[PDB]
């Protein structure tokens, strides 16, 4: 997530338990970059993905 969308091995969205969707590619405020164990992160396709 800290790498983000610009760098390829990164994430595009981070989805929280409430369902709030944060977009990583447009200036994410450093507060919501932090993540807990319940959240989902939409990483890019990587090696070994099926």
């Amino acid at each position: 997530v800290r790498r983000g969308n610009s760098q390829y091995p990164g994430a595009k969205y981070i989805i929280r338990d409430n369902g709030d969707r944060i977009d990583l590619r447009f200036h994410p405020k450093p507060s919501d970059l932090h993540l807990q164990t319940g959240y989902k992160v939409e990483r890019h396709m990587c090696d070994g993905d099926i």
Binding site: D17, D20, K29, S31, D32, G38
Partner: protein, 333 residues
Amino acid sequence: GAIFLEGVTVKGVTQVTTQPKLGEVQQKCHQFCGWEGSGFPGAQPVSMDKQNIKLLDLKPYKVSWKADGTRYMMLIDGTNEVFMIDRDNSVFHVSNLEFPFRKDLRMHLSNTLLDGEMIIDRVNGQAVPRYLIYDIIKFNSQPVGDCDFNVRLQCIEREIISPRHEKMKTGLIDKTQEPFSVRNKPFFDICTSRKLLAKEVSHEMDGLIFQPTGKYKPGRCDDILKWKPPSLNSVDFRLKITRMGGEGLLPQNVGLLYVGGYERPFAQIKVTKELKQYDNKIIECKFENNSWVFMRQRTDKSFPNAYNTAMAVCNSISNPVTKEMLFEFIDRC
């Protein structure tokens, strides 16, 4: 709300709701400050950190110490035309303050903007509201705000504090009849503040505020650094005590610490019934450990402070700047 000074009521100070004069006062305050946005046009300090403290050696500074008060701007534009402005941009009308002109004592100041505080000072066991003039913005259409900081301090002194004393010396102004005292906030060199922290006023001091000698700039001024004791820390949290139990999860109640302009819970607090009274109310919190905890509830404020404010305070509390921590840092110079 509209409360001039919390704790003590001051006679003659009257909040004004009348839109025609409110608009003129606010707009011409913006005009005097050359302030881009809306709201409070005055210069706003920032909390000191490891990066801020460097700025002290890059350029000379003047020092004063923060005392408990509310941010408050006097606009002097006539005999009774004194409209009185706080950080919330609210305007109050004060009656009996008269500002003599130094050349003609019968002439009163106009188009003058001062920077100061309402501080309650208990002397002889009685609360005496006082105004400390630490900066001047505008003076009789002259751009004194573009002058040097020491120059503006001397304008404050000679043009305001002295003519009034001249007129109480002759009795044409009565110190007893004015609603509250008017003074200038004392300023010293960076060397003097070291004695402040054999410090016998260590408990009587709320912190330090450092003023650069440069020209006045409105809004957020990055090189004006306030020093706040870390153990004494501290933001206005808008709280929604919420029973957040996710789908498939045991229902749980938590306190969500919201801030200004950020739609999501900035942080969480250990919600408790002894904290349930102030449901949906603006509060201050202390970040001693990884948990923000409640000291006092601010009924006066209605909005949580900004996200950048939250960031600045988080950085400041993460690097606790203590009196011994900067004492040596200036003693080396």
